[PDB]
Amino acid sequence: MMTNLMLLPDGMRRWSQKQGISLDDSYAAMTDKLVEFTGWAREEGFTTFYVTVSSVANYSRSEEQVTTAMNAFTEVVRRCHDTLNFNYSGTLEVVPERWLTELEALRAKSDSQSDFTLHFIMGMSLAHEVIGIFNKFNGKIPALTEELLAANAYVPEPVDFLIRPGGHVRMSSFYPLMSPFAEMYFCPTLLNDMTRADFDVALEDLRERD
Amino acid sequence: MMTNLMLLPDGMRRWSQKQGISLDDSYAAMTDKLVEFTGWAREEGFTTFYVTVSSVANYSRSEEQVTTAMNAFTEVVRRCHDTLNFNYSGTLEVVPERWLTELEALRAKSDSQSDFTLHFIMGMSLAHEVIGIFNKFNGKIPALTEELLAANAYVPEPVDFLIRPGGHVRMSSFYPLMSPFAEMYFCPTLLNDMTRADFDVALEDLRERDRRYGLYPV
Ligand SMILES: [Mg+2]
Ligand SMILES: [Mg+2]
C-alpha cells in the first residue's frame, strides 16, 4: 500500500554562504543530509521516497554547478543502493551521460527485494514530460487514457506528501503531474539545517490535515 | 515588466457555517468578493486575473451545489464584463451547457480592446487537460512542440503569482501546466473574509521574492 513522500531539496548555495564553505562542501553536506532523510522516510513507513534531483532549467546552470550537484546526488545512491531499491525517471536526454551511465549501473544492482524505494526524478518539467508522452503514443492509440498517462508519467504513482525546505513557496518545475491530492509543506529551514525533529513536525502538520 | 495573477477561491462552505447563513448566501458573498478582487487586481497593474472556477471533481457535487456555484461565478462576469476583456477555458465538456452558453455570450459582449482580462478556468485537472491535448493532435502532427502545447493549455501563458486563501496548503487540481516557476502564496483567511489589506500584504510577500528560474544569480 503506497504511502509516499517527495522532497524538493533546496538551499545549498545559501548554506555555503552561511557556513563560509565552498559549493562543493555544501553539496557534500547535502549528500549526508539526504542519506539521513532517506533513512527517516524509511523509518516513518513511506514506501517510496521521491527526490526531485533536477529540473530542465537546472541544467543551464554552469558546467561546474551541474557537476557539483549531480555528483552529490549520485553519491547518495552510491552509499544507499545496496540496501534499498533504487529507481529513476525524467527527461533523461538533458542529463549528462556520465551521470546517467553511473546511475543506471547503480539502479541495475540495487536491492530489488527491498520494500523501500529511493526514486530520483531528473530533468523535471511538465511541458517536456507531456511532449514525451505525446510523442510515444502519437498515432498509435485511439485516445490517451488516464491509465496510460499514469503509467508513463515521471512520478509513477500519486504523491501523498511533498516537502520543500529552503523558504521558497513554489514548485520550480518539480510539480508531480499525477498528484491532484498531494498535500504540500513548506518551511524556511535550509535543507542542510533540517533536523529529524524538523522532519517530524512537518509530518505532524501533513498527517493532521486528514 | 508585465505580471499576471491567479486566485484559487476556497472556503464557501466554512464561511456559511461561520456566518450562520445558507450556502447560497455564502456564494453571494463570494460573487461580491470576486468583483472586488478583480478590481484590486486591475488597480495593481496585472494584465490578466485568472480565477480557477472549478475542478473536474467539483462536478460530482449535487446538481443543486453545481448550479449554485456556477451561477455565483457567472454573476461576477454579468457585473463586470462590460469594461474588461473576458475569456474562459478548461475541460468544458463537464460544464453544464447552460453556463457555457451564457459565458460565451458574456465574452462576446465584453470589451476585447481592454488592457485588462478576467479569465475563468473551469474543470481544471491536469490529467484531463493532457488527455484533451493528446486527443486533439493524435495522428495529425509529427510531434508535439512546446509552442503547440503552450497554445493549447488551459492557462494561455505562465502565471507569475497565485493566491490560495482558505488554509489548505495544496494545489488540488489547479496547478497551471505551463507555469514551472509560479510563486504560490497561501493564507488561512477564508476568501469571503479577505480585505484589500490582506490582498496587499499577499502582494508584498509575492513581489519581494527573488525569482531565479532554476539558475544561480550572476
Ligand atoms: Mg535553490
Ligand atoms: Mg474547499
H or E segment and range at residue B33? helix B23-43
The C-alpha cell at B10 is 476556497
The C-alpha cell at A106 is 547503480
Chain centre to alpha carbon of residue A146: 23
Residue B10 DSSP one-character state: -
Please give the residue range of the domain that contains residue B208. Answer: 1-218
Asked if residues A58 and B213 have their Cβ atoms less than 8 Å apart, the reply is no
**Cross-strand pairs, A122:** A90
How many domains does chain A divide into?
A: 1
Kindly state whether B182 is in contact with chain A, defined as any CB-CB distance less than 8 angstroms: yes
**Cross-strand pairs, B163:** B7, B185
Burial of residue B36 (number of CB atoms within 10 Å: 0-12, 13-18, 19+): middle
Q: Give chain A's radius of gyration (CA, Å).
A: 17
Asked if residues B27 and B65 have their Cβ atoms less than 8 Å apart, the reply is no
Ligand nearest to the CA of B215: 1
Name the residue among B74, B78, B120, B80 with its Cα closest to residue B98. B74
Kindly state whether A13 is in contact with chain B, defined as any CB-CB distance less than 8 angstroms: yes
Kindly state whether B218 is in contact with chain A, defined as any CB-CB distance less than 8 angstroms: no
Residue B144 and residue B142: Cα distance in Å, rounded? Answer: 7
Asked if residues A85 and A117 have their Cβ atoms less than 8 Å apart, the reply is yes
Experimental method used, please? Answer: X-ray
Q: Give chain B's radius of gyration (CA, Å).
A: 17
Asked if residues A57 and B212 have their Cβ atoms less than 8 Å apart, the reply is no
Q: Which residues of B touch A134 (CB under 8 A)?
A: 133-134, 137, 143-144
Q: Ligand 1 center to residue A167 CA distance, Å?
A: 9
Neighbours of A210 (CB within 10 A): 6
Chain centre to alpha carbon of residue B87: 11
Helices B97-109 + B63-80 axis angle, to 10: 0
Burial of residue B27 (number of CB atoms within 10 Å: 0-12, 13-18, 19+): buried
Helices B196-208 + B23-43 axis angle, to 10: 50
Asked if residues B76 and B35 have their Cβ atoms less than 8 Å apart, the reply is yes
Q: Ligand 2 center to residue B13 CA distance, Å?
A: 7
Residue A143 and residue B102: Cα distance in Å, rounded? Answer: 30
Q: What backbone torsions phi and psi does residue B54 show, to the nearest 5 degrees?
A: -160, 155
Q: Ligand 2 center to residue B26 CA distance, Å?
A: 13
